[PDB]
Amino acid sequence: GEALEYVNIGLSHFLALPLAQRISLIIIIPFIYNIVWQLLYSLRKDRPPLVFYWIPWVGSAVVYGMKPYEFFEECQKKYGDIFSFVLLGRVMTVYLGPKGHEFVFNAKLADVSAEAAYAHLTTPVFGKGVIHDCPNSRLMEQKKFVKGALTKEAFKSYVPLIAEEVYKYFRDSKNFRLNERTTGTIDVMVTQPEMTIFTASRSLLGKEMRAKLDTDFAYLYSDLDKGFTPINFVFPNLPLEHYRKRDHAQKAISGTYMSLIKERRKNNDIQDRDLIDSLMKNSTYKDGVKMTDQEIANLLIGVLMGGQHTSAATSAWILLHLAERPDVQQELYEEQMRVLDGGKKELTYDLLQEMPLLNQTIKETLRMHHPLHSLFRKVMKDMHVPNTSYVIPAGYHVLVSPGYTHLRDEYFPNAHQFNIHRWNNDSASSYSVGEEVDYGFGAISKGVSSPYLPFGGGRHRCTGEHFAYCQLGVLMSIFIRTLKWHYPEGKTVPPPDFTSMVTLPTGPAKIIWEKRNPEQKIG
Ligand code: HEM
Ligand SMILES: C[C@@H](c1ncncc1F)[C@](O)(Cn1cncn1)c1ccc(F)cc1F
């Protein structure tokens, strides 16, 4: 009773402490509070173990962002395959391994949302109305629109254009100019992004859109390029300047696409050339709405942008791994001479399919260097993980990471050794190992239990797998037949830089190239 007066009294003296002790208690009450909250949380047996952190809110973000596969391995040894950690205000429950791939890539639409996790990151860059700034059902239909331009007949015609672009680059780039140099050094992280965007542009976007890249316009891609960073997860729209040249470039680049979209319909200049022709002819949803010309341009940005960063990272890794392995280059070259009749057969999408060792090299690189170490979903409903007393409460996030499983000896013997022969009689981009399902964009595998899942699975599954292998196929067939490359003295494979949007190599990652035929000229 008389004590009740003194909780009151003490509350008044609390308010009248010096700014030195108030400030410090501002930073000790929450620190001491979250340490004692965690301790209570670990007695909850319907929750997966939460890994201890000191700083509240920040959580474990520092070690997760820097070495996420080392973090995952350390957590796996302590608490098994399921565990939570807090990440800059959110709570992520990792499910490692194939049962984890299944728990997350085959989750019900009712249980998890990818849109809910990524809309803050994608929509500022791509524009609105597409990808994650729409309902999952719109997403499924957009993928059906894009995927309707990623056919075998499309792929037969992209191969001469892609190959033209590779040669034009060897001819004209300051990094090569093969008609004036026979040897040189390139930074793969400078060359590979440029090659990707040229080849992707010319093929999917058309010749006009490829043409604009030879000009100043190219910088808008570079400006747009920088708004695609995990920082948009914390400060999505933060009134600074790289946020404006980002948005400037979005408006600017989406304008060029609509200008072309609009003039093509004005002229009925609508053929089967590029994905711009395709999305024009076929972008009406199942309920009857057509995509606005701006929505078509923003899907263009998002598709080109995402495939840009994964494809460019992958050919970088193919070069860096091969730079160290002249025996694999020798092997890949023999297959080039055998399949292409010593160079006296033009490269075709068909002939690419007969090059298993090349396709096995892409396959193996993508095993060791998955471009997305972590995929996320926001949990919408309380989720129960079977064989288990755990519930993942709504508002948590689930995190699948097949790239970690990729690097496990459990599923890949000597997982840390680059070995393309681990895929003998198995050069497939991927393989639907049984029964299939359709979420709107075509029949894809129903199970998602494979330990090798470079293109994920389920509804959010990649619709650019076959394009990626095409691009990477021509690019690497031509690199192989034209150049030998090795590392500078002392140099080896760089470690991955996980902090960016894709695990790309820690730069600079340089290789010395030599012409196989010094006296050869590109016409
Ligand atoms: C080496 C190349 C690529 C790799 C390794 C890769 C990997 C992936 C993965 C793992 C996902 C699943 C995302 C998630 O589950 O959260 C995905 C989604 C997707 N990717 Fe790719 N990707 C590649 C290239 C491309 C290209 C070139 C395109 C376009 C031509 C593309 C378009 C898409 C689309 C449209 C989705 C659907 C996302 C969704 O439905 O939520 N990707 N990709
Ligand atoms: C959202 C994005 C992503 N980026 C980084 N970490 C996780 C991610 F989910 C991604 O899934 C990645 N991606 C897959 N293939 C190409 N890019 C994506 C999907 C569709 C798209 F049109 C553009 C795009 F970037």
Residue numbers in the entry: 9 to 531
Q: What text comes from the article?
A:
Target-based azole resistance in Candida albicans involves overexpression of the ERG11 gene encoding lanosterol 14α-demethylase (LDM), and/or the presence of single or multiple mutations in this enzyme. The azole antifungals inhibit sterol 14α-demethylase (CYP51, SDM), thereby preventing biosynthesis of the essential and fungal specific sterol ergosterol, and resulting in the collateral synthesis of toxic sterols. We have used, as surrogates, structurally aligned mutations in recombinant hexahistidine-tagged full-length Saccharomyces cerevisiae LDM6×His (ScLDM6×His) to elucidate how differential susceptibility to azole drugs is conferred by LDM of the C. albicans Darlington strain.
The ScLDM6×His Y140H I471T mutant provides a surrogate X-ray crystal structure for the clinically relevant Darlington LDM mutant of C. albicans, and for the LDM Y131F I475T mutant from the phytopathogen P. pachyrhizi. Similar crystals of ScErg11p6×His Y140H I471T in complex with VCZ formed after 20 days of incubation under a single experimental condition (46% PEG 400 pH 9.2). The lower resolution (2.9 Å) of the ScLDM6×His Y140H + I471T structure may have limited the observation of discrete structural changes, such as the location of key water molecules. In contrast, it was not apparent how the Y140H and I471T mutations interact to confer preferential high-level resistance to the short-tailed azole VCZ, which appears to bind in the active site in comparable conformations in the Y140H and Y140H I471T enzymes. Unfortunately, the structures obtained do not elucidate how the Y140H and I471T mutations interact to confer enhanced resistance to short-tailed azoles, i.e., the double mutation maintains enzyme function in the presence of the short-tailed triazole inhibitors FLC and VCZ.
